[PDB]
Short mmCIF file of C-alpha atoms in Angstrom, two decimals:
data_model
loop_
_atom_site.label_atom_id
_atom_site.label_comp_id
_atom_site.label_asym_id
_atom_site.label_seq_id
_atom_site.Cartn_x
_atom_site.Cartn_y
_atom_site.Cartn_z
CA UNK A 262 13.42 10.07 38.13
CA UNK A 263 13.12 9.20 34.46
CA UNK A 264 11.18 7.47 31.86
CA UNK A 265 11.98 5.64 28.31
CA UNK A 266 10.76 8.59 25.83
CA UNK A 267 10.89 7.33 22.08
CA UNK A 268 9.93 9.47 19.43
CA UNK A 269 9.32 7.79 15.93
CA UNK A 270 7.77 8.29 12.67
CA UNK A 271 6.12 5.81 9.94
CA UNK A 272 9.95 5.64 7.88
CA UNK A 273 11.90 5.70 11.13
CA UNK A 274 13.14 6.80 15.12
CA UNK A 275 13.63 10.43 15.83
CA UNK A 276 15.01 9.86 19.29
CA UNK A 277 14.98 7.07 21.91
CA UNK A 278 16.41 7.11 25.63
CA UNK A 279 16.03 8.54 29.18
CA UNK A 280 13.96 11.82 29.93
CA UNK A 281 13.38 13.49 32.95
CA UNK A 282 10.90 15.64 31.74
CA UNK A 283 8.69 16.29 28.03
CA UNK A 284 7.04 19.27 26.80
CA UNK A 285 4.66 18.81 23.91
CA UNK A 286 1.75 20.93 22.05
CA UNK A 287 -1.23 18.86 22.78
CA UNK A 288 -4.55 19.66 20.34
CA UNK A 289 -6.46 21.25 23.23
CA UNK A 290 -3.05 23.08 25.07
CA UNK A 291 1.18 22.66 26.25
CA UNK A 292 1.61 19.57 28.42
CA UNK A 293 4.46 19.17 30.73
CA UNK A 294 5.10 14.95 31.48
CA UNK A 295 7.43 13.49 34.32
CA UNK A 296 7.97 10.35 35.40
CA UNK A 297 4.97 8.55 36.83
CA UNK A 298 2.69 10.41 34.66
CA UNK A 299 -1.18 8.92 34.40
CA UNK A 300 -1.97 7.01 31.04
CA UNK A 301 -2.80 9.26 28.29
CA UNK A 302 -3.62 9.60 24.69
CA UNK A 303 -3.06 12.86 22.83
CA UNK A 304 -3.06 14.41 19.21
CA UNK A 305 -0.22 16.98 18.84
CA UNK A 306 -0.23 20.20 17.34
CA UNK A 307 2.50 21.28 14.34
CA UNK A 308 5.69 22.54 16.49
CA UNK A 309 8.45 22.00 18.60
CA UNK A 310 8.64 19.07 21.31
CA UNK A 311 11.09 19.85 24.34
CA UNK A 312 12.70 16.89 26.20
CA UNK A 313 14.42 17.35 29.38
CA UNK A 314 17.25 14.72 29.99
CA UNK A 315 19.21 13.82 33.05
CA UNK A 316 20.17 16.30 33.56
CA UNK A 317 20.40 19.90 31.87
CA UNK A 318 20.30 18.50 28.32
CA UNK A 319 17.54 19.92 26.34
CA UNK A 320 16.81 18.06 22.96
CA UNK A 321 14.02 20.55 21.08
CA UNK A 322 12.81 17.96 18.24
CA UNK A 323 10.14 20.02 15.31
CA UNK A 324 7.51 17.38 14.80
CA UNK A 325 4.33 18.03 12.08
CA UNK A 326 2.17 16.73 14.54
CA UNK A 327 1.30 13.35 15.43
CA UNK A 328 0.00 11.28 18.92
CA UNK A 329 1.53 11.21 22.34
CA UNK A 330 0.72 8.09 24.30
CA UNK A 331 1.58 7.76 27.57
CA UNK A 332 2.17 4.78 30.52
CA UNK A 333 3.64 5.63 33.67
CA UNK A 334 6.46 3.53 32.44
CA UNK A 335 6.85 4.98 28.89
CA UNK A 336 6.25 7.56 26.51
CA UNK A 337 5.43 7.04 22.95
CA UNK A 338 5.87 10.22 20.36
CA UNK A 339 4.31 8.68 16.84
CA UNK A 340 5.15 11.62 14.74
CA UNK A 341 4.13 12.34 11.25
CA UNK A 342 6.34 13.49 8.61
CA UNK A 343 3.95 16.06 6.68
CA UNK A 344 1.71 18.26 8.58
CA UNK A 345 -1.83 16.72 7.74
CA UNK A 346 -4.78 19.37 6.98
CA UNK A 347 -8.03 19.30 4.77
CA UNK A 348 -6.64 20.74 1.49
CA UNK A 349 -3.52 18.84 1.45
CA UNK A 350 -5.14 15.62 2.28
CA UNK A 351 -8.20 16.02 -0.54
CA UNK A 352 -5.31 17.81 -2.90
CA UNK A 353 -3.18 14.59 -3.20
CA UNK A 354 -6.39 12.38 -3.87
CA UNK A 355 -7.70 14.58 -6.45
CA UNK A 356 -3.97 14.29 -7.86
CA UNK A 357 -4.37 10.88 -7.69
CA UNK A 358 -7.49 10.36 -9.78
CA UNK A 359 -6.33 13.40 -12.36
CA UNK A 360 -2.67 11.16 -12.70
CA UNK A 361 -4.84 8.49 -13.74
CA UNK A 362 -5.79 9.95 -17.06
CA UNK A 363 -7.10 6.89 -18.78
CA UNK A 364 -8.97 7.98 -22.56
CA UNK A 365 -10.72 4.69 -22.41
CA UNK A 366 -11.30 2.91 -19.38
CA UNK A 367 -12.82 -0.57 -21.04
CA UNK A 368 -14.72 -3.10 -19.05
CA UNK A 369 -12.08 -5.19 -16.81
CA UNK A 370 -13.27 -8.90 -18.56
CA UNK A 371 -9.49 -9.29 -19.72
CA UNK A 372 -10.70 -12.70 -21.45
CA UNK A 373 -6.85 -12.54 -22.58
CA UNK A 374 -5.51 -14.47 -18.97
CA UNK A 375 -3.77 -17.54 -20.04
CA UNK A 376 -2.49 -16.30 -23.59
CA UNK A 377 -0.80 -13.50 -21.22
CA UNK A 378 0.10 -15.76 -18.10
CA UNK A 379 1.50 -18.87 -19.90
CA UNK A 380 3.55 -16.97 -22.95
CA UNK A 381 5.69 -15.13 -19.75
CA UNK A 382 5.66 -18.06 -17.90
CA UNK A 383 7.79 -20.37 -20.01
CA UNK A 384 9.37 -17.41 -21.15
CA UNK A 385 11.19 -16.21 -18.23
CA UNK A 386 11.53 -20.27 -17.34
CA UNK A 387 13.84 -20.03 -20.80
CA UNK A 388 16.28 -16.87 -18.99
CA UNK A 389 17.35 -18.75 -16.30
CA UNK B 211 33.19 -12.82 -43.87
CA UNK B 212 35.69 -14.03 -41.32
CA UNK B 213 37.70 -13.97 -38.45
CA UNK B 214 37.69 -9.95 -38.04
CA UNK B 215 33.78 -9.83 -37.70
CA UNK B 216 33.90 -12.26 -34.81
CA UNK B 217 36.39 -10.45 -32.82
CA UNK B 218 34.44 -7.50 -32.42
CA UNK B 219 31.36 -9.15 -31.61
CA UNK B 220 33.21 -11.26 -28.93
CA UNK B 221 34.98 -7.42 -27.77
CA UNK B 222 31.35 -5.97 -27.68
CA UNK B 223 29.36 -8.71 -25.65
CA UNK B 224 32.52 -8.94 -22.98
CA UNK B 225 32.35 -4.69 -22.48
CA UNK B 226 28.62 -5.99 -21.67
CA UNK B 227 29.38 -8.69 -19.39
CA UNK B 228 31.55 -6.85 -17.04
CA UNK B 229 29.12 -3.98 -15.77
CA UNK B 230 26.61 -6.54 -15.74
CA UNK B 231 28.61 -8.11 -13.19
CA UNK B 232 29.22 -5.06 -11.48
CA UNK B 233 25.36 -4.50 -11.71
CA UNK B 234 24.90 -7.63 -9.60
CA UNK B 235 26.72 -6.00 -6.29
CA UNK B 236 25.25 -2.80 -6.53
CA UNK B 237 21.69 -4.59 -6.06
CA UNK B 238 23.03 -6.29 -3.16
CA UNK B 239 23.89 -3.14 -1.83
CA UNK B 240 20.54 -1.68 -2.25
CA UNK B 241 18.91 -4.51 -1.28
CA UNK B 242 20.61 -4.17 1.76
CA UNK B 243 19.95 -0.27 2.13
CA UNK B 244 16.29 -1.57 1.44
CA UNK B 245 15.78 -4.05 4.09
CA UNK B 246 17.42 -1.11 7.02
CA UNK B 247 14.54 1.11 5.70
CA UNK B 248 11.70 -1.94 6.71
CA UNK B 249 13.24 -2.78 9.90
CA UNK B 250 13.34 1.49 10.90
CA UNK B 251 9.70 1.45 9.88
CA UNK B 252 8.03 -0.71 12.24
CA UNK B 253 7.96 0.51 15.64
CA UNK B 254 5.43 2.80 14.98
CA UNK B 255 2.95 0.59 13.03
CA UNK B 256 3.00 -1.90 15.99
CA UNK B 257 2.37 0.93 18.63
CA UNK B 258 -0.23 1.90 16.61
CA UNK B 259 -2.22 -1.41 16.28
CA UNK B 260 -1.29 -1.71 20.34
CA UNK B 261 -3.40 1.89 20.86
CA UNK B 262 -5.75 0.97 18.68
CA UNK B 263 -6.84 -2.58 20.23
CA UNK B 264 -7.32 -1.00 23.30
CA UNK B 265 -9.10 1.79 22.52
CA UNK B 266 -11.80 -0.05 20.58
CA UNK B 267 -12.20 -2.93 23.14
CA UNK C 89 5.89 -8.97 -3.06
CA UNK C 90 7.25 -10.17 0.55
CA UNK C 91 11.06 -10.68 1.13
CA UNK C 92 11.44 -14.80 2.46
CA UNK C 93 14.75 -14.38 1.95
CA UNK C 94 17.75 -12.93 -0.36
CA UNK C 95 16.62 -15.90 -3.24
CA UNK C 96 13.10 -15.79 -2.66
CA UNK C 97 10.44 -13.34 -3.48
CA UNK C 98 7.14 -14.21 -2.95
CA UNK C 99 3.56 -12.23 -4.37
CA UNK C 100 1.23 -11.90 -1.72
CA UNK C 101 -2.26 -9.81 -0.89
CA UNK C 102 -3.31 -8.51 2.36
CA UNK C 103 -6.11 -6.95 3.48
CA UNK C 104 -5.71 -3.37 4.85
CA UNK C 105 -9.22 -1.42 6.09
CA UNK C 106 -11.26 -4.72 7.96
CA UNK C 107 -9.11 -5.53 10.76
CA UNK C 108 -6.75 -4.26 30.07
CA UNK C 109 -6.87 -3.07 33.51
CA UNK C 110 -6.75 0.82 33.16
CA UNK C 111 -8.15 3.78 30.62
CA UNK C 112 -6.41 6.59 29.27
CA UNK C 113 -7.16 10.02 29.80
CA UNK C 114 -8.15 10.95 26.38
CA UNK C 115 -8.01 15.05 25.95
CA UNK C 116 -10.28 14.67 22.70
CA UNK C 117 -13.36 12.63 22.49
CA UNK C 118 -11.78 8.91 22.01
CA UNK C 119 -14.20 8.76 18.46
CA UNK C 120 -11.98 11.43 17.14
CA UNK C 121 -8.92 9.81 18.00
CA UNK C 122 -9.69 6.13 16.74
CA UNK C 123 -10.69 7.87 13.41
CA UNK C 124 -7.52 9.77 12.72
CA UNK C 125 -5.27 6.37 14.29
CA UNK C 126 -6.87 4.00 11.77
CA UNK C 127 -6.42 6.03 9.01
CA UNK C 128 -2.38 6.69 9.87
CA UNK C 129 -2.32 2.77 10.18
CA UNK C 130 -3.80 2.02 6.82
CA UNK C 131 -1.38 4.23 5.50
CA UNK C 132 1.87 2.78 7.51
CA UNK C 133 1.11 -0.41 5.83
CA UNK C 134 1.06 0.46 2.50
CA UNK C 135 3.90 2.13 2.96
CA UNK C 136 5.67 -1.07 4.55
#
C-alpha cells in the first residue's frame, strides 16, 4: 500500500517518507505511480510534483525538472535546482570564458617553481 | 622614549588578540555548518552513479 | 582540498569525465538519458 518516495537535489533532500501514490510531469506526458510500479527511468518536465500520502495528505513539491527512477520498492526524484535549457546552459559558459579576461595569456613554462614553492614553504613553517 | 609608548602598544596588540580568539570559534562554527552541507549533498550523486552503471552495462 | 579530519587538510586531484536482472522502461531513447545523467554527475562532483 505504499512505497519509500525520496525527492532530492545535488545541495540537499526535498522530501523523504511513505507515499501511496506520485504524480509527476514526465518529458513525453503526466504519470501517475503506486506501489508495485514496473522499473522506470524518466526525465521530468519544469512543474509541480503531487505526492499522495497515507492517507489524504497531499504534499505538491515545484521541481525545475530533473529524473524519476523507479523500483517496485522505491522511488527516486533527483531534482535540479535551476531549470536547464540551451541559452542558459551556453550563457553561463560564455560568462565563464568573458570573466576570464586575461590581457596576456603567456606560455604556462612557469620556470619560477621552486623559488615560489620553497620561499612559502619555510615561510608558513616559521607561523606556526 | 619610555614607559608610555609601551603601554599603548601592549593596549593595541591585546584589542587584537581577543577577536582573534573569538575568530577561532566562529570557524568552528562554520566549519561545522560546512560539513552538514557535504553530508545533505550526497544522496543524489550516489543514485546517480547507481543509474548510470546500469544503464551503460 | 579533502577534509581527514578537523586538524588535517589534505590537497588532492580527481578525475571527473573518464569514469542486473531486470531493464527499465525508459520513456526516451536510453542515449538521451545517459547523456544528460553524466553531465548532472560531472557537475555534482565539482560541486562536492
Amino acid at each position: 500500500i505504499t512505497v519509500h518516495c525520496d525527492i532530492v537535489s545535488a545541495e540537499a533532500e526535498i522530501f523523504s517518507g511513505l507515499v501511496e501514490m506520485v504524480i509527476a510531469h514526465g518529458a513525453l506526458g503526466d504519470l501517475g505511480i503506486a506501489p508495485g510500479h514496473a522499473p522506470l527511468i524518466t526525465d521530468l518536465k519544469p512543474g509541480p510534483i503531487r505526492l499522495v500520502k497515507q492517507g489524504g495528505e497531499q504534499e505538491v513539491y515545484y521541481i525545475s525538472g530533473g529524473f524519476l527512477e523507479v523500483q517496485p520498492n522505491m522511488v527516486k526524484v533527483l531534482a535540479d535546482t535551476v531549470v536547464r535549457a540551451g541559452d542558459l546552459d551556453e550563457a553561463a559558459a560564455q560568462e565563464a570564458l568573458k570573466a576570464a579576461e586575461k590581457a596576456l595569456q603567456g606560455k604556462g613554462a612557469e620556470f619560477d617553481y621552486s623559488a615560489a614553492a620553497a620561499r612559502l614553504a619555510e615561510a608558513a613553517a616559521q607561523l606556526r | 622614549a619610555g614607559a608610555k609608548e609601551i603601554r599603548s602598544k601592549i593596549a593595541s596588540i591585546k584589542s587584537t588578540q581577543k577577536i582573534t580568539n573569538a575568530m577561532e570559534k566562529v570557524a568552528v562554527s562554520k566549519m561545522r555548518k560546512a560539513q552538514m552541507r557535504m553530508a545533505a549533498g550526497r544522496p543524489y550523486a550516489e543514485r546517480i552513479r547507481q543509474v548510470i552503471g546500469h544503464l551503460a552495462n | 582540498n579533502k577534509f581527514v579530519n578537523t586538524m588535517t587538510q589534505k590537497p588532492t586531484v580527481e578525475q571527473l569525465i573518464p569514469l542486473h536482472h531486470w531493464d527499465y522502461l525508459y520513456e526516451p531513447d536510453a542515449k538521451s538519458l545517459l547523456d544528460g545523467l553524466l553531465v548532472r554527475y560531472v557537475e555534482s562532483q565539482v560541486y562536492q
